[PDB]
Design a protein around this motif. Sequence first.
Motif, PDB file in Angstrom:
ATOM      1  N   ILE A   1       0.952  -0.984   0.144  1.00 25.72           N
ATOM      2  CA  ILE A   1       0.040  -0.108   0.054  1.00 25.72           C
ATOM      3  C   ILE A   1       0.921   1.338   0.003  1.00 25.72           C
ATOM      4  CG2 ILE A   1      -1.859  -1.500   0.825  1.00 25.72           C
ATOM      5  CD1 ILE A   1      -0.652   0.727   3.788  1.00 25.72           C
ATOM      6  N   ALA A   2       0.841   2.113  -1.022  1.00 25.88           N
ATOM      7  CA  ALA A   2       2.110   2.936  -1.180  1.00 25.88           C
ATOM      8  C   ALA A   2       1.400   4.415  -1.626  1.00 25.88           C
ATOM      9  CB  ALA A   2       2.612   2.254  -2.431  1.00 25.88           C
ATOM     10  N   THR A   3       2.209   5.222  -1.955  1.00 29.28           N
ATOM     11  CA  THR A   3       2.200   6.593  -2.165  1.00 29.28           C
ATOM     12  C   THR A   3       1.264   7.190  -3.196  1.00 29.28           C
ATOM     13  OG1 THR A   3       4.155   7.198  -3.700  1.00 29.28           O
ATOM     14  CG2 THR A   3       4.517   6.669  -1.253  1.00 29.28           C
ATOM     15  N   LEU A   4       1.007   8.329  -3.065  1.00 24.76           N
ATOM     16  CA  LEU A   4       0.193   8.851  -4.181  1.00 24.76           C
ATOM     17  C   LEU A   4       0.374  10.612  -3.764  1.00 24.76           C
ATOM     18  CD1 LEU A   4      -2.652  10.468  -5.095  1.00 24.76           C
ATOM     19  CD2 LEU A   4      -1.656   8.976  -6.824  1.00 24.76           C
TER      20      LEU A   4
ATOM     21  N   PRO B   1      -6.389   2.447   9.722  1.00 22.20           N
ATOM     22  CA  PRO B   1      -5.710   2.206   8.449  1.00 22.20           C
ATOM     23  C   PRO B   1      -4.294   1.463   8.694  1.00 22.20           C
ATOM     24  CG  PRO B   1      -5.351   4.408   9.201  1.00 22.20           C
ATOM     25  CD  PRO B   1      -6.286   3.776  10.257  1.00 22.20           C
TER      26      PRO B   1
ATOM     27  N   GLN C   1      -9.570   1.218  -1.525  1.00 19.53           N
ATOM     28  CA  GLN C   1      -8.755   0.188  -2.189  1.00 19.53           C
ATOM     29  C   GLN C   1      -9.051  -1.072  -1.486  1.00 19.53           C
ATOM     30  OE1 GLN C   1      -4.672   1.531  -0.516  1.00 19.53           O
ATOM     31  NE2 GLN C   1      -5.637   1.107   1.671  1.00 19.53           N
TER      32      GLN C   1
ATOM     33  N   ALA D   1      -2.265   8.692   9.480  1.00 20.70           N
ATOM     34  CA  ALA D   1      -1.452   9.810   8.891  1.00 20.70           C
ATOM     35  C   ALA D   1      -2.306  11.218   9.323  1.00 20.70           C
ATOM     36  CB  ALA D   1      -1.093   9.749   7.581  1.00 20.70           C
TER      37      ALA D   1
ATOM     38  N   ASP E   1       4.593  13.588  11.998  1.00 21.31           N
ATOM     39  CA  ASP E   1       4.156  13.522  10.612  1.00 21.31           C
ATOM     40  C   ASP E   1       2.733  12.939  10.814  1.00 21.31           C
ATOM     41  OD1 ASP E   1       5.069  11.124  11.956  1.00 21.31           O
ATOM     42  OD2 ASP E   1       6.302  10.554  10.084  1.00 21.31           O
TER      43      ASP E   1
ATOM     44  N   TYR F   1       7.886  10.006   0.778  1.00 24.05           N
ATOM     45  CA  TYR F   1       7.073  10.328   2.151  1.00 24.05           C
ATOM     46  C   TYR F   1       8.069  10.016   3.391  1.00 24.05           C
ATOM     47  CZ  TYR F   1       2.586   9.903  -0.323  1.00 24.05           C
ATOM     48  OH  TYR F   1       1.341  10.203  -0.893  1.00 24.05           O
ATOM     49  N   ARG F   2       7.539  10.096   4.406  1.00 22.17           N
ATOM     50  CA  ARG F   2       8.126   9.733   5.659  1.00 22.17           C
ATOM     51  C   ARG F   2       7.420   8.329   6.333  1.00 22.17           C
ATOM     52  NH1 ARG F   2      12.015  13.277   7.802  1.00 22.17           N
ATOM     53  NH2 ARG F   2      12.034  15.237   6.899  1.00 22.17           N
ATOM     54  N   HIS F   3       6.220   7.978   5.922  1.00 23.89           N
ATOM     55  CA  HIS F   3       5.352   7.002   6.374  1.00 23.89           C
ATOM     56  C   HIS F   3       4.723   6.388   5.258  1.00 23.89           C
ATOM     57  CE1 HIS F   3       3.377   5.445   9.846  1.00 23.89           C
ATOM     58  NE2 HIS F   3       2.376   5.636   9.343  1.00 23.89           N
ATOM     59  N   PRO F   4       4.149   5.327   5.535  1.00 27.65           N
ATOM     60  CA  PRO F   4       3.271   4.909   4.436  1.00 27.65           C
ATOM     61  C   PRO F   4       1.677   5.447   4.979  1.00 27.65           C
ATOM     62  CG  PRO F   4       3.587   3.003   6.238  1.00 27.65           C
ATOM     63  CD  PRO F   4       4.669   3.991   6.472  1.00 27.65           C
ATOM     64  N   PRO F   5       1.091   5.831   4.048  1.00 34.43           N
ATOM     65  CA  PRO F   5      -0.421   6.143   4.107  1.00 34.43           C
ATOM     66  C   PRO F   5      -1.400   5.138   3.976  1.00 34.43           C
ATOM     67  CG  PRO F   5       0.103   6.391   1.938  1.00 34.43           C
ATOM     68  CD  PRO F   5       1.393   6.073   2.371  1.00 34.43           C
ATOM     69  N   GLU F   6      -2.676   5.507   4.193  1.00 36.83           N
ATOM     70  CA  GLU F   6      -3.906   4.514   4.116  1.00 36.83           C
ATOM     71  C   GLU F   6      -4.224   4.426   2.722  1.00 36.83           C
ATOM     72  OE1 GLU F   6      -3.809   7.430   5.426  1.00 36.83           O
ATOM     73  OE2 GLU F   6      -5.662   8.516   4.727  1.00 36.83           O
ATOM     74  N   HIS F   7      -4.057   5.180   1.793  1.00 34.63           N
ATOM     75  CA  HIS F   7      -4.603   4.947   0.345  1.00 34.63           C
ATOM     76  C   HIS F   7      -3.415   5.208  -0.644  1.00 34.63           C
ATOM     77  CE1 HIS F   7      -4.244   9.531  -0.123  1.00 34.63           C
ATOM     78  NE2 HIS F   7      -4.643   9.510   1.001  1.00 34.63           N
ATOM     79  N   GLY F   8      -3.607   5.359  -1.812  1.00 33.96           N
ATOM     80  CA  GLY F   8      -2.784   5.605  -2.754  1.00 33.96           C
ATOM     81  C   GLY F   8      -2.736   4.455  -3.563  1.00 33.96           C
TER      82      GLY F   8
ATOM     83  N   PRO G   1       9.141   5.052   0.732  1.00 36.48           N
ATOM     84  CA  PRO G   1       8.474   4.375  -0.101  1.00 36.48           C
ATOM     85  C   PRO G   1       8.943   4.064  -1.554  1.00 36.48           C
ATOM     86  CG  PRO G   1       7.047   5.610   1.406  1.00 36.48           C
ATOM     87  CD  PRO G   1       8.521   6.032   1.413  1.00 36.48           C
TER      88      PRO G   1
ATOM     89  N   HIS H   1       4.207  15.809   0.077  1.00 38.42           N
ATOM     90  CA  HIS H   1       5.515  15.385   0.415  1.00 38.42           C
ATOM     91  C   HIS H   1       6.521  15.663  -0.773  1.00 38.42           C
ATOM     92  CE1 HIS H   1       2.980  13.396   3.119  1.00 38.42           C
ATOM     93  NE2 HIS H   1       3.954  13.386   3.983  1.00 38.42           N
TER      94      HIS H   1
ATOM     95  N   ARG I   1      -4.510  -2.677   8.087  1.00 41.07           N
ATOM     96  CA  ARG I   1      -5.731  -2.249   8.262  1.00 41.07           C
ATOM     97  C   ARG I   1      -6.524  -3.338   8.990  1.00 41.07           C
ATOM     98  NH1 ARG I   1      -7.200   2.205   5.166  1.00 41.07           N
ATOM     99  NH2 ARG I   1      -9.291   1.513   5.279  1.00 41.07           N
TER     100      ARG I   1
END
Lengths: 52, 49, 105, 157
Positions: free
Chosen positions: A1-4, D19, B30, D124, D106, C85-92, C79, A25, D25
Amino acid sequence: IATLAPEPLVEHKHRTLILHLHPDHPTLLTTRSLGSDANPTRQWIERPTTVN
Amino acid sequence: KAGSFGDLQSRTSTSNDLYANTNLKLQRPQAGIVHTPFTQAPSGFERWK
Amino acid sequence: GLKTDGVDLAYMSFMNGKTQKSIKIDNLHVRTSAPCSLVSHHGYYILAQCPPGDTVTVGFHDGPNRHTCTVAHKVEFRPVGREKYRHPPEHGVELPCNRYTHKRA
Amino acid sequence: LDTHFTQYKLARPYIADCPNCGHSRCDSPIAIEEVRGDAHAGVIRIQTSAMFGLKTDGVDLAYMSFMNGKTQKSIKIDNLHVRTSAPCSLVSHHGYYILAQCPPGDTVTVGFHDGPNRHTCTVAHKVEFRPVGREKYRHPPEHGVELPCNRYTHKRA
């Protein structure tokens, strides 16, 4: 699960993309002018910036 | 313009109507999980501070 | 992992004396700049979700004593992606990262 | 503490999808929505989906009702932990909602300890604490001038 990164603001000009841009970022943007002249660009963008 | 100053524009505080050009764009959640991707410019009131 | 003999990955055998002490894992703490999150242990080896940190700092609590251990190691988490980033998000979007498993098999 | 049975009697500890719930999750009752690092005083107002406060019925704000199963569990608050880059300081809880004095971070990372399990929830959110003033501190001091900051209350009324 990754960036955007948040979507850009596309703005038209004459053979020119103004792009007001505003990430979350530091984002490495880059391009490829598809001529055999590549003329690429790279820049990490963390500060919001209108580019061209 | 969204992100720019005045992305939210309410006449006053009471005014239920306003103008919200925030470029709020929902994306699909997702991998079969309940949530709400809201992709949005943080405010032009966040910047401007 | 298991005890000295045969049972329950989620128990805890270190050496006290010349001897083992195969007992419960009750209060493990890996940590760095912030407290990490355990992922799984197997054998000598633990996987843990950490933030970036100049060091790495590990430790359980036997119960009478803290009895921790700490070390230097340059840590980061980029990532995979052109976003730093500095950290993984919930989405993307999902895309091919490098990562360790949960499992033992 | 008996003036907001609007929420207390009539609202339940909601459970949603955290999350990065330790591993990944999960569905934590303390699923964090609406992080607000928008004030100045080192403080964040948070909403858990869990409704701590009084019990199911009538007593003691400082107890702890989340959802386990379909069911509540209205018991003691013993070992709450909000945290960020560092461990925060609780300020007060009321309803679904907690106020806590945090440093910048953060992320935001919340969790109590039921007693058998850690059972935390994390999220986040870009946090900062500028104090109001032409000084860009990282933290409130013990002294200095007072001037009109923005900040959340201790109270419930």
